[PDB]
């Protein structure tokens, strides 16, 4: 089996109707948010979404979806609605690209040559083992541990090529007593203590799911507090998680490479440290208000073409 390109199977894909204004997959899955997503052809993006294996490509005016699960066939409408939560297709971008552009200079000038950076609305679970797994690290070394860690610990759904897809682990799985011996195994290092110590503080001491459920009906402030309690979840993990799984868009991860990019093209300067990066995280909330983490991905995805 291999992995299914628009124009050798067009029977099997479904169209979402979805301009480059509102959705460029090629600035979103590569661009630091999910790690689940590799354009194995060009312009043909496969990865696990929903314990499933989907291709994604678009033309000019539509998102072309399809999903390998018995018989090939196109995704039903039920499996899309998955594809559209996941992309937050109700959430009209452009309305959100003007309101930024008018009340910031330089990012109405990078909003017209970088359209359709949409946040991704990703599972908890996923989203929180996968940014424990991204500090001191780049896109490329976190993707290869995630891939490693799903390998190890999450179900085989299907091989397509020599790519084989894995679900992503449960909590479950996760907390076993030999997870942080064998994490360490595949080169994740310390993060492997804060995978396996994390998965247990969330099944025997938060209830499970249920927590992440509860952070998500919470404010900004609450969410971010109560991750923090966690192994490996500190400002930067915790603003991560806010904003791409737990719906605070007011959310706005602050790192070093943020920074280059605040010193750089706003002039800005500390009045790296905790204090500093309180301070900018304040500084763009106030500029870009309610959706700033949702302008931040503009501006991150821009930076890294
Ligand atoms: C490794 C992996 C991912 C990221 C990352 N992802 C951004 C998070 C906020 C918006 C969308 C994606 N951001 C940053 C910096 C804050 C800009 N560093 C990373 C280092």
């Given at each position: 089996?291999?992995?299914?390109?628009?124009?050798?199977?067009?029977?099997?894909?479904?169209?979402?109707?979805?301009?480059?204004?509102?959705?460029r997959?090629?600035?979103?899955?590569?661009?630091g948010?999910?790690?689940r997503?590799?354009?194995?052809?060009?312009?043909?993006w496969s990865?696990?979404?929903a314990?499933?294996?989907?291709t994604?490509?678009?033309?000019?005016?539509?998102?072309?979806?399809?999903?390998?699960?018995?018989?090939?066939?196109?995704?039903?409408?039920?499996?899309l609605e998955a594809?559209?939560?996941?992309?937050?297709?109700?959430?009209?971008l452009?309305?959100?690209?003007?309101?930024?552009?008018?009340?910031?200079?330089?990012?109405?000038?990078?909003?017209?040559?970088?359209?359709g950076?949409?946040?991704?609305?990703?599972?908890?679970?996923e989203?929180?083992?996968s940014?424990?797994?991204?500090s001191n690290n780049?896109?490329?070394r976190?993707?290869?541990?995630?891939?490693?860690?799903?390998?190890?610990?999450?179900?085989?759904?299907?091989?397509?090529?020599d790519v084989?897809?894995?679900?992503?682990?449960?909590?479950?799985?996760?907390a076993?007593?030999e997870?942080?011996?064998?994490?360490?195994?595949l080169?994740?290092?310390?993060?492997?203590?804060?995978?396996?110590?994390?998965?247990?503080?969330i099944?025997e001491?938060?209830?499970?799911?249920?927590?992440?459920?509860?952070?998500?009906?919470?404010?900004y402030?609450?969410a971010?507090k109560?991750?923090?309690?966690?192994?490996?979840?500190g400002?930067?993990?915790?603003?991560?998680?806010?904003?791409?799984?737990?719906?605070?868009?007011?959310?706005?991860?602050?790192?070093?490479?943020?920074?280059?990019?605040?010193q750089?093209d706003?002039?800005?300067?500390?009045?790296?440290?905790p204090?500093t990066?309180?301070?900018?995280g304040?500084?763009?909330?106030?500029?870009?208000?309610?959706?700033?983490?949702?302008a931040?991905?503009?501006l991150?995805?821009?930076?890294?073409?």
């Amino acid at each position: 089996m291999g992995h299914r390109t628009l124009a050798s199977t067009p029977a099997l894909w479904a169209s979402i109707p979805c301009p480059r204004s509102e959705l460029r997959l090629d600035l979103v899955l590569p661009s630091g948010q999910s790690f689940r997503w590799r354009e194995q052809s060009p312009a043909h993006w496969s990865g696990v979404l929903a314990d499933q294996v989907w291709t994604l490509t678009q033309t000019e005016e539509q998102l072309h979806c399809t999903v390998y699960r018995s018989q090939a066939s196109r995704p039903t409408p039920d499996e899309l609605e998955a594809v559209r939560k996941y992309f937050q297709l109700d959430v009209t971008l452009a309305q959100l690209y003007h309101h930024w552009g008018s009340v910031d200079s330089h990012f109405q000038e990078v909003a017209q040559k970088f359209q359709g950076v949409r946040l991704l609305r990703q599972d908890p679970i996923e989203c929180l083992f996968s940014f424990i797994c991204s500090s001191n690290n780049n896109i490329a070394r976190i993707t290869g541990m995630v891939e490693r860690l799903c390998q190890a610990f999450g179900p085989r759904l299907i091989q397509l090529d020599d790519v084989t897809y894995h679900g992503f682990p449960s909590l479950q799985a996760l907390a076993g007593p030999e997870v942080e011996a064998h994490l360490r195994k595949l080169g994740l290092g310390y993060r492997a203590r804060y995978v396996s110590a994390s998965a247990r503080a969330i099944l025997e001491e938060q209830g499970g799911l249920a927590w992440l459920q509860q952070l998500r009906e919470s404010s900004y402030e609450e969410a971010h507090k109560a991750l923090c309690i966690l192994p490996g979840v500190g400002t930067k993990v915790a603003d991560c998680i806010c904003l791409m799984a737990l719906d605070k868009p007011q959310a706005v991860p602050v790192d070093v490479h943020m920074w280059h990019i605040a010193q750089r093209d706003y002039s800005w300067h500390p009045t790296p440290s905790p204090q500093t990066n309180k301070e900018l995280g304040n500084f763009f909330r106030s500029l870009w208000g309610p959706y700033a983490g949702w302008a931040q991905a503009v501006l991150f995805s821009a930076d890294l073409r």
